[PDB]
């Protein structure tokens, strides 16, 4: 009944600086490593650390190799490109590091990608972070321009349509234009088999293919199939051999420094251990946890930075590292460790990620203020038999997060009722410390979505019912298979956003966006006078949505077409059992379909339509001309009219008239018309109820809407979360509203009840109810307003304060004042006795 802090030490600690006393690094080493951490996060279009700038070695060595590889098969050229980069790159070794490696010539730098988007590199050339020398980089960007993925996709689209997508108002810009990307790396293959084994497999396949081509009698209708296979397998060998050499040259650096530079005998012996690890790994199979963690990081560098840029950190880390945690900690067969040693190791991993400079474009640094890049790993969930997957490696991951307190990487916890309590308590510890993560995903919901997509497999080799349990978050919102095979290899497969709120706004202006772009954003579906009935505004929005979603998916498939032809990824292909077996490129082979796309600001356009039908066509209180006049005036006049449109029946009020329209709006237009589209993998394109921080930007990109919003008033709280200051029936009612959609939840909990000894039981009771209501996602914010206000006044005393923005976490002081005030304004929800009965609690 009493909400005293579980730790008596917090009784004396001022509430406006609580989170400045929560961090507790497992060792002195990780304490030093956090203090001297080379942060790469940025704010207001500017990096927080002063030394952060772009490198040029990748651009240089990729260009050199490309010129020299003319005439050769593109797959091999790409392998030779990666090889040249790895062979000639300056390697980096820092002090106190155990997990070593980097993706640039300088630890403060980040590589660029002229082979992707010409515009993206151009923007860095015109910035304070341009690669040096600036003239050489400019020459490199000009050389790559006709070979860029952007230049290959553009001719097959009306330049007028592309301009509409480049506005980023109704449609997100295509990935070939931005260079943005995601991937789920087959880490399991590297750790289990090693790269030498993959080379031997490829070499054997080549000899078999060559033997077939010289086999009498020849068949020209079949024999020529070996050409693409041999080219792919040869590229895999080149790529793998380069990574091994690159990892061993990294180890040689450790040996050199330990023998010629390092003065501390403790560090010297440590660097020699790291040298032995880099020597064997990833050439040989991993035998211990230290090997596994190093392999995983090496593999991460190649797949997400060196071979190609790919935002994300998708992996099932606990399940992935468990066999090596077991060999090291549990059985102590190789590299004997304690549980705390594992905790320190994960701490060091989080720091390496915190130092990972992302060569992403500027446009994708604005949508996520105060962050480096979106790094989201997944833990928990269930195994193949539906049994609990949680283990001590899971706990080690979670404890390290709580201890080191870094905003990145974020964590997704797949919640099942099978999940043991001991792990759940660790989940709660991170949340109660206001980290914003682990966010909670519905285990069964995601598993079923893997089974559904598996049916559309072109080669009939989708994920089995057992393999469906092996899923992770690709980025912030969407599920995806992990493992040695059938993993998503590109953002072209799944990802991207569409904004129905913008589609509706232009639907009342003949496809013309007057508020933001000041141009024709959609097709001329008709003027206000042509629209004589509510059925016409329903078809006006339909054609706007159809036209928009068609461009969104077509641009990704066209990108996919040229990605497998000119942007081959022979390394990723080498560590995929499917690609290695069939001799195909990672982008070419797509065994497990996963075509998602994100409808953001859907509820905003949904509520607006209800107010239109009733006030304009049913009651005839206002004509479409007056409403359009009221919008274009940004509610300067028509104040009694504005409050009347907000008064109109909304979503989440159990209103038959309102809910009856939204239901028909989601299953027929938003989800119906979208399901009609088939992507590259032969599967349907299904919606994702979520908002990846776009709402803050898009909300400023969308005009005033008949839901009561002014011009630029941003936004929807989440992808399905209720509008700010609209939920007036408690936190339990928010659970009632989201659960209605069956064909992302942001919540703020009170600090005192969470820092108490009764905190876990209340939180767990909420989660169990949340799971029973079949809600897909939920994240929690545990931070007092006073501490945020104190962080605004004296930022230099609140560096370790971490808050949850959207789909990611960030340091509150590294967020612009405009962004801070937006997060603060949100009301902290409390639980009543009626709510507790609904959650079926038991104290």
């Amino acid at each position: 009944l009493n909400f005293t802090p579980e730790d008596p030490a917090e009784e004396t600690i001022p509430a406006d600086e609580l989170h400045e006393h929560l961090q507790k690094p497992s060792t002195a080493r990780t304490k030093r490593l956090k203090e001297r951490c080379r942060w790469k996060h940025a704010s207001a279009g500017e990096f927080i650390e002063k030394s952060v700038t772009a490198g040029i070695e990748r651009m240089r060595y990729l260009t050199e190799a490309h010129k020299a590889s003319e005439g050769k098969p593109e797959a091999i050229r790409r392998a030779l490109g990666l090889a040249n980069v790895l062979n000639k790159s300056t390697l980096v070794l820092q002090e106190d590091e155990f997990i070593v490696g980097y993706h640039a010539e300088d630890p403060n730098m980040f590589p660029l990608y002229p082979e992707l988007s010409h515009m993206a590199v151009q923007d860095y050339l015109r910035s304070d972070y341009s690669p040096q020398p600036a003239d050489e980089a400019a020459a490199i960007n000009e050389y790559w321009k006709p070979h860029s993925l952007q230049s290959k996709c553009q001719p097959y689209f009306d330049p007028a349509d592309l301009g509409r997508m480049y506005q980023v108002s109704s449609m997100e810009a295509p990935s070939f234009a931005s260079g943005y990307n995601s991937i789920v790396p087959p880490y399991e293959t590297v750790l289990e088999d090693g790269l030498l084994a993959r080379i031997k497999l490829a070499e054997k396949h080549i000899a078999e293919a060559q033997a077939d081509m010289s086999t009498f009698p020849w068949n020209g209708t079949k024999g020529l199939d070996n050409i693409a296979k041999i080219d792919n397998w040869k590229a895999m060998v080149i790529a793998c051999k380069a990574v091994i050499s690159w990892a061993r040259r990294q180890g040689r650096l450790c040996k050199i420094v330990a023998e010629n530079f390092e003065t501390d005998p403790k560090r010297q012996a440590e660097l020699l251990e790291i040298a032995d690890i880099c020597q064997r790994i990833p050439a040989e199979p991993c035998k211990g946890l230290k090997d596994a963690m190093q392999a995983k990081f090496f593999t991460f560098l190649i797949c997400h930075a060196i071979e190609r840029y790919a935002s994300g950190y998708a992996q099932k880390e606990d399940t992935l590292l468990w066999p090596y945690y077991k060999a090291s900690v549990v059985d102590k067969k190789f590299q004997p460790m304690s549980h705390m040693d594992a905790v320190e190791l994960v701490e060091m991993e989080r720091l390496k990620i915190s130092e990972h400079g992302a060569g992403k474009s500027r446009a994708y640094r604005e949508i996520f203020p105060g962050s480096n890049d979106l790094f989201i790993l997944t833990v928990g969930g269930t195994n193949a038999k539906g049994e609990d997957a949680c283990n001590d490696m899971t706990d080690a991951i979670l404890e390290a997060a709580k201890r080191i307190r870094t905003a990145e990487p974020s964590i997704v916890f797949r919640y099942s009722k099978k999940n043991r309590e001991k792990t759940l308590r660790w989940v709660f510890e991170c949340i109660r410390d206001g980290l914003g993560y682990p966010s909670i995903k519905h285990d069964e919901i995601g598993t079923e979505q893997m089974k559904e997509y598996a049916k559309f497999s072109l080669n009939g080799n989708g994920a089995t019912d057992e393999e469906a349990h092996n899923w992770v978050n690709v980025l912030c919102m969407s599920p995806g298979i992990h493992g040695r095979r059938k993993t998503q290899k590109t953002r072209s497969e799944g990802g991207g956003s569409i904004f129905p709120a913008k589609l509706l706004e232009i639907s009342l202006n003949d496809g013309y966006d007057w508020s933001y772009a000041d141009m024709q954003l959609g097709p001329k579906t008709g003027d206000l006078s042509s629209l004589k009935s509510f059925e016409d505004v329903w078809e006006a929005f339909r054609k706007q949505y159809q036209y928009a979603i068609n461009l969104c998916i077509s641009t990704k498939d066209v990108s996919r077409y040229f990605e497998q032809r000119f942007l081959q990824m022979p390394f990723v292909s080498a560590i995929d059992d499917g690609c290695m077996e069939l001799g195909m490129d990672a982008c070419a082979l797509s065994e497990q379909p996963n075509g998602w796309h994100n409808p953001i600001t859907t509820i905003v356009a949904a509520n607006s339509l209800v107010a239109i039908k009733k006030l304009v066509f049913e009651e005839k209180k206002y004509t479409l001309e007056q409403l359009s006049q009221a919008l274009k005036a940004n509610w300067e006049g028509f104040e009694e009219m504005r409050v009347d449109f907000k008064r109109a029946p909304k979503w989440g009020n159990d209103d038959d008239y309102a809910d009856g329209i939204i239901t028909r709006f989601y299953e027929e237009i938003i989800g119906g018309e979208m399901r009609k589209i088939t992507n590259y993998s032969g599967g349907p394109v299904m919606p994702t109820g979520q908002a990846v921080g776009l709402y803050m930007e898009v909300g400023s990109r969308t005009g005033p809407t008949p839901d009561g919003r002014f011009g630029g008033e941003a936004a929807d709280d989440g992808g399905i979360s209720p509008y700010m200051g609209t939920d007036k029936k408690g936190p339990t009612a928010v659970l009632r509203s989201v659960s209605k959609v069956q064909k992302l939840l942001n919540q703020r909990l009170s600090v005192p009840i969470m820092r108490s000894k009764h905190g876990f039981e209340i939180w767990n009771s909420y989660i169990k109810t949340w799971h029973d209501l079949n809600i897909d996602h939920v994240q929690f914010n545990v931070v007092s307003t006073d501490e945020m206000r104190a962080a605004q006044r004296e930022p230099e005393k609140h560096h370790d304060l971490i808050v949850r923005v959207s789909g990611y976490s960030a340091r509150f002081v590294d967020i612009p004042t405009y962004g801070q005030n937006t997060i603060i304004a949100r009301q902290e929800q409390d639980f009543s006795a009626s709510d507790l009965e609904f959650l079926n609690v038991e104290i």
């Binding site: 080379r38 070794l93 010629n260 530079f261």
Partner: protein, 41 residues
Amino acid sequence: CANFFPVPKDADDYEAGKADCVREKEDEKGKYWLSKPIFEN
């Protein structure tokens, strides 16, 4: 700070006259080392 370290003859990346140019640097954050492949100046 430029120190030449000849690449061993048994290394995967071994080439004639190849060496690692290891240089120690240190900024406001901390100390680190850089290894750049060079071919006998």
